[PDB]
Design an enzyme around this catalytic site. Structure first.
Site, mmCIF file in Angstrom:
data_model
loop_
_atom_site.group_PDB
_atom_site.id
_atom_site.type_symbol
_atom_site.label_atom_id
_atom_site.label_comp_id
_atom_site.label_asym_id
_atom_site.label_seq_id
_atom_site.Cartn_x
_atom_site.Cartn_y
_atom_site.Cartn_z
ATOM 1 C CG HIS A 1 -3.412 -0.383 6.419
ATOM 2 N ND1 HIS A 1 -3.235 -0.223 7.773
ATOM 3 C CD2 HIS A 1 -2.392 0.283 5.824
ATOM 4 C CE1 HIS A 1 -2.181 0.543 7.987
ATOM 5 N NE2 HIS A 1 -1.657 0.869 6.820
ATOM 6 C CG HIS B 1 -0.385 0.138 2.506
ATOM 7 N ND1 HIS B 1 0.087 -0.938 3.235
ATOM 8 C CD2 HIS B 1 -0.235 1.225 3.295
ATOM 9 C CE1 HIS B 1 0.512 -0.505 4.409
ATOM 10 N NE2 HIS B 1 0.347 0.805 4.462
ATOM 11 C CG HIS C 1 0.058 4.405 4.469
ATOM 12 N ND1 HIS C 1 -0.598 3.635 5.405
ATOM 13 C CD2 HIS C 1 -0.854 5.299 4.003
ATOM 14 C CE1 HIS C 1 -1.847 4.066 5.525
ATOM 15 N NE2 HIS C 1 -2.033 5.074 4.681
ATOM 16 C CG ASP D 1 4.866 2.716 7.034
ATOM 17 O OD1 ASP D 1 3.939 3.241 6.362
ATOM 18 O OD2 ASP D 1 4.567 1.850 7.875
ATOM 19 C CG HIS D 2 4.569 -0.049 3.729
ATOM 20 N ND1 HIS D 2 5.283 -0.943 4.503
ATOM 21 C CD2 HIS D 2 3.600 0.462 4.527
ATOM 22 C CE1 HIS D 2 4.742 -0.996 5.709
ATOM 23 N NE2 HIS D 2 3.705 -0.168 5.745
ATOM 24 C CG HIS E 1 4.498 -2.816 9.597
ATOM 25 N ND1 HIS E 1 5.375 -1.847 10.024
ATOM 26 C CD2 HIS E 1 3.552 -2.175 8.868
ATOM 27 C CE1 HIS E 1 4.969 -0.663 9.578
ATOM 28 N NE2 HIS E 1 3.873 -0.837 8.867
ATOM 29 C CE1 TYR F 1 -5.569 4.187 9.652
ATOM 30 C CE2 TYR F 1 -6.907 2.597 8.495
ATOM 31 C CZ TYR F 1 -5.737 3.312 8.610
ATOM 32 O OH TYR F 1 -4.749 3.107 7.667
#
Ligand SMILES: [Zn+2]
Ligand SMILES: [Zn+2]
Ligand SMILES: [Zn+2]
EC number: 3.5.2.6
Length: 266
Positions: free
Chosen positions: A159, A83, A85, A87-88, A224, A190
């Site tokens: 997510h 996805h 975001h 951090d990816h 993660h 969320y």
């Protein structure tokens, strides 16, 4: 008199930024990111695929690891994402500039990547990164083939709207290994119920739990690694404790149900 606050950088636990050497998962598949963020390199005769890059500052480390694996910048053909975001997908724009790589993603992930994660349904502008463009849009169940390895997209919205599991078959010991790189099933901070920016959020997550449960899944990896009980720092027993896709989905659903009950109470 009080100025407006300074911008706050997206800071993360040190282990998310801790470089590691390449860790082989199967004959053609390696973890090349950090101790606590997945970035998978799949090496084929006709070039390499990267699934995720981790954080924005990881680009040079990824290229160093690719070099160590015999993959030059020109050899990187394709970037796929769990996805979009920070951090990816953090270093994707930079990787495109420095390599041959083109990005394939679904429409939701493409739109979010193109705004560098800004106006996130839940995070707003709190967690952003350099925007990048997708070169190819994929539909649910669509396959992409590189050097004879076939990658299948399985949409698992929740997510993020564009959250995707990618599956492919590698080998280990002359035997097939069906790898499932399943996206995050968390909902950190969320609003789950009656969210005006995501009205069917709960239904999508429930469908995504079922999708993940049913994936072809000899080995599960997650963006993660801790979510699937991987320990990249544990060498030969990095993957020993890894969850099945079934167990991952179940745990995620149980967590999600608890979060729903807490929200109702909150
Ligand atoms: Zn092969
Ligand atoms: Zn995320
Ligand atoms: Zn994440």
């Amino acid at each position: 008199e009080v100025p407006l606050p300074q911008l706050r950088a997206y800071t993360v636990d040190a282990s998310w930024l801790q470089p590691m050497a390449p860790l082989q998962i199967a004959d053609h598949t390696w973890q090349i990111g950090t101790e606590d963020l997945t970035a998978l390199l799949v090496q084929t005769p006709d070039g390499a695929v990267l699934l995720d890059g981790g954080m924005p500052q990881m680009a040079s480390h990824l290229l160093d690891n690719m070099k160590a694996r015999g993959v030059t910048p020109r050899d990187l053909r394709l970037i796929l994402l769990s996805h979009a975001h920070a951090d990816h997908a953090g270093p994707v724009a930079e990787l495109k500039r420095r390599t041959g790589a083109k990005v394939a993603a679904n429409a939701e992930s493409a739109v979010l990547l193109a705004r560098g994660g800004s106006d996130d349904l839940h995070f707003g502008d709190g967690i952003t990164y350099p925007p990048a463009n997708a070169d190819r849009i994929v539909m649910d169940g669509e396959v992409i083939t590189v050097g004879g390895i076939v990658f299948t997209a399985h949409f698992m919205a929740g997510h993020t709207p564009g959250s995707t599991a990618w599956t492919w078959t590698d080998t280990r010991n002359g035997k097939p290994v069906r790898i499932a790189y399943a996206d995050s099933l968390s909902a950190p901070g969320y609003q789950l119920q009656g969210n005006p920016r995501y009205p069917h959020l709960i239904e999508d997550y429930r469908r995504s739990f079922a999708t993940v449960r049913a994936l072809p899944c000899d080995v599960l990896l997650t963006p993660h690694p801790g979510a699937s009980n991987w320990d990249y720092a544990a060498g030969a027993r990095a993957g020993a404790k890894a969850l099945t896709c079934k167990a991952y989905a179940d745990a995620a659903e149980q967590k999600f149900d608890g979060q729903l009950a807490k929200e109702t109470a909150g």
